[PDB]
Design a protein around this ligand. Structure first.
Ligand SMILES: [Cl-]
Ligand SMILES: [Zn+2]
Lengths: 597, 174
């Protein structure tokens, strides 16, 4: 009958076919990540191919039912999703070529190794070795070399590929009725239909810029403080008013200043909110770690892990014989099958990691009652935010205490707290500007606002403007630095990294209020609090189902992305920096350069 | 009395093509099933006693689908495969058969019907594997808007309980 009703019958066939076929792709992909064989790595492609095809087939098959002739919101969403011409809306060659582009970039990146300018028998890869330098080296030159080698080898090689990349991908974007590839991505946060909850592809740019403003003071101050500390480690190389030399920021790009802790620690004479030693002493095994986390969730009103979770998961490294990939992952195979794959070691870190990944699983179950196409965090950054809330409560000394891993009568200390806070800023706050500038430049190279010859002239105008970072060596168009970063040269929207950050703070905030929290926002643990849970599980059981703006409302009572909870989390620190920066200079000169002479 | 043949039997049918065993004459005690935590449902809709005095239907369904073999009840299984009258009744027993009906490779023999014009009248059956179209029109799959109404479950040993194989036996009383 009606094209709507006959479209329902379509989805109702898809969900049934997807469930089955998706599970086969998962099971195979699983056998592989836990038993790296040839027979296993073989199936990992087959079922994974039936999948890609099946979707392509179901996509064009759905490209019939006219989105325009529907009034049921859900069925409209689901169809919209299934209707992705994406790669198949181009010429015969223009598509296959884009793939050659995408594919080689991924491989020149993962493969590219740089050789010693004097010892050509040893050559380092980005991981490890190269990233090992950027992370530990206190030698101005050794760091200077690695940073430049990489952006010089793979840097250049990617310039031509990317050149064409931005064209074909843009051609595709405008071909689907999007202002540019940048508009294609911002699309993810788009919502049409339910009013008072809509959100336009441009609204993101506005909301991200408007919010980034309120981060500046905090950042400028973290910046100023880190600078002065760096000046000490690298005497005479840094300017008391200049930007910071990109190669001295802790990792290859300066995405995170995490590794800078060593030389920026406020009170080096403090010590170890590291219970690794304690866990090891009380004979804790993987089991305990995971059972302990399960308890944490049950403590807030969430379900015990499924029988088949303890039954089918792999919480320990198989060791010899059976080889397996170890990146901690939370699997949702579907069919009610949930698993965690993790080569657990008895560290406070793996302990926190396990609370994080068991958060993803807990989200996966919450929305598993949704129809296949709706099982997934609201927007790209919801799932990460949730997993991060957990590690946030589990990290508190309060929690480590009540769990018997921290001495029963150990005290706070307003100094050991300023430390922890900084360790966090170095990572959480340092990334934001970087992440936000990266995507800005990327967005503009999509709205066409940057000429092929001002690609690095405009890159670094901004690293100096926004992030407050200067290049150690000047870079012309022989390079293409905003591409030596995995996410860039492997085609991934970077902005998620920014929103999820904000989100994850708006979440933790509500959930502490909700669970009636006393002290500063950062010392909060939400355990034993079924009350908070309820509120979390409110936006959890939705999945992609309601607009992401609604979903946020469910936990934070607001239709939008607010950054004040992120600053509240950093208030005891934020003010403390304003004191250190008493006689330091705060801000920078885009003009100063390391190389200049 | 001839209950052994029923639930102790080897092969069970799919839901859409269920079995109705006719048991009259002989006498059974009911202590056979009374005493046993083997079953995971054992709900009854009328009584729960004895008197040494009868229809037994059997089929297999997904875990989460067991809640539908009961009076009233939502749809899909209850709408297109097996329906209990809101009225009449006896008991409904089920047990997890993940060992038997599920293989680690995937078992798709057991099937169900997800598309049909209308709902089943209680105790009605439909073994009509005829290409479905949401308008009565005949079907020539792969023509668009044509789907086969009969699908296989796909019982893997590793699914969640909601997706594991359960054998059902509805005991009707007459
Ligand atoms: Cl860079
Ligand atoms: Zn994660």
């Amino acid at each position: 009958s009606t094209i709507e009703e006959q479209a329902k019958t379509f989805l109702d066939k898809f969900n049934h076919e997807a469930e089955d076929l998706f599970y086969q792709s998962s099971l195979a992909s699983w056998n592989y990540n836990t038993n790296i064989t040839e027979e296993n790595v073989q199936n990992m492609n087959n079922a994974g191919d039936k999948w890609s095809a099946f979707l392509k087939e179901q996509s064009t098959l759905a490209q019939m039912y006219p989105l325009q002739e529907i009034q049921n919101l859900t069925v409209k969403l689901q169809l919209q999703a299934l209707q992705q011409n994406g790669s198949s809306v181009l010429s015969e060659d223009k598509s296959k070529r884009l793939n050659t582009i995408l594919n080689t970039m991924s491989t020149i990146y993962s493969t590219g190794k740089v050789c010693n300018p004097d010892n050509p028998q040893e050559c380092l890869l980005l991981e490890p070795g190269l990233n090992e330098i950027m992370a530990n080296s206190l030698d101005y030159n050794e760091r200077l070399w690695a940073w430049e080698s990489w952006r010089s080898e793979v840097g250049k090689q990617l310039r031509p590929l990317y050149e064409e990349y931005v064209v074909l991908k843009n051609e595709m974007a405008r071909a689907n009725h999007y202002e540019d590839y940048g508009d294609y991505w911002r699309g993810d946060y788009e919502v049409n239909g339910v009013d008072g909850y809509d959100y336009s592809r441009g609204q993101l740019i506005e909301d991200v810029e408007h919010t980034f403003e309120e981060i500046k003071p905090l950042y400028e101050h973290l910046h100023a403080y880190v600078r002065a500390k760096l000046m000490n480690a690298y005497p005479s190389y840094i300017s008391p008013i200049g930007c910071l030399p990109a190669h001295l920021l802790g990792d290859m790009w300066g995405r995170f200043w995490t590794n800078l802790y060593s030389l920026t620690v406020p009170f080096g004479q403090k010590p170890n909110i590291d219970v690794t030693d304690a866990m090891v002493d009380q004979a804790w095994d993987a089991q305990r770690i995971f059972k302990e986390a399960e308890k944490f969730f049950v403590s807030v009103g969430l379900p015990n892990m499924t029988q088949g979770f303890w039954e089918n998961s792999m919480l320990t490294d198989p060791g010899n014989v059976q080889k397996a990939v170890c990146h901690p992952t939370a699997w949702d195979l579907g069919k009610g099958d949930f698993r965690i794959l993790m080569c657990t070691k008895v560290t406070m870190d793996d302990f926190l990691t396990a609370h994080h990944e068991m958060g993803h699983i807990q989200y996966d179950m919450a929305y598993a009652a949704q129809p296949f196409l709706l099982r997934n965090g609201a927007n790209e950054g919801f799932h990460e935010a949730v997993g991060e809330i957990m590690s946030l409560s589990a990290a508190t000394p309060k929690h480590l205490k009540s769990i018997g891993l921290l001495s029963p009568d150990f005290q706070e200390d307003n100094e050991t707290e300023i430390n922890f806070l900084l360790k966090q800023a170095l990572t959480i706050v340092g990334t934001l500007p970087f992440t936000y500038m990266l995507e800005k430049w990327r967005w503009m190279v999509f709205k066409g606002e940057i000429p092929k010859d001002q690609w690095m002239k405009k890159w670094w105008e901004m690293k100096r403007e926004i992030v407050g970072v200067v290049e150690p060596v000047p870079h012309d168009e022989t390079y293409c630095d905003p591409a030596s970063l995995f996410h860039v040269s492997n085609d991934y929207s970077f902005i998620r990294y920014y929103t999820r950050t904000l989100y994850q703070f708006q979440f933790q905030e509500a959930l502490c209020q909700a669970a009636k929290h006393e002290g500063p926002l950062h010392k909060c643990d939400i355990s034993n609090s079924t009350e908070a849970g309820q509120k979390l599980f409110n936006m959890l059981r939705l999945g992609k189902s309601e607009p992401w703006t609604l979903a946020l409302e469910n936990v934070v009572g607001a239709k939008n992305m607010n950054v004040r909870p992120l600053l509240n989390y950093f208030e005891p620190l934020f003010t403390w920096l304003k004191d250190q920066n008493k006689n330091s200079f705060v801000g920078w000169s885009t003009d100063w350069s390391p190389y200049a002479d | 009395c001839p209950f052994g043949e029923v639930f102790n039997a080897t092969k069970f049918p799919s839901v859409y093509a269920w079995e109705r065993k006719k048991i009259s004459n002989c006498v059974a005690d009911y202590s056979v099933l009374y005493n046993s935590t083997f079953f995971s449902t054992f709900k009854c809709y009328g009584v729960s006693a004895t008197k040494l005095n009868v229809y037994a239907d059997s089929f297999v369904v997904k875990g989460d689908d067991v809640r539908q073999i009961a009076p009233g009840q939502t749809g899909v299984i209850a709408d297109y495969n097996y329906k209990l009258p809101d009225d009449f009744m006896g008991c409904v027993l089920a047990w997890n058969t993940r060992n038997i009906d599920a293989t680690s490779t995937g078992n798709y023999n057991y099937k169900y019907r997800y598309l049909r014009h209308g709902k089943l009248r209680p105790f009605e059956r439909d073994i009509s594997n005829v290409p479905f179209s949401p308008d009565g029109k005949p079907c020539t799959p792969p023509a668009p808007n044509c789907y086969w109404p009969l699908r296989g479950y796909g019982f893997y040993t590793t699914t969640g309980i909601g997706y594991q194989p359960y054998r059902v036996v509805v005991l009707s009383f007459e």
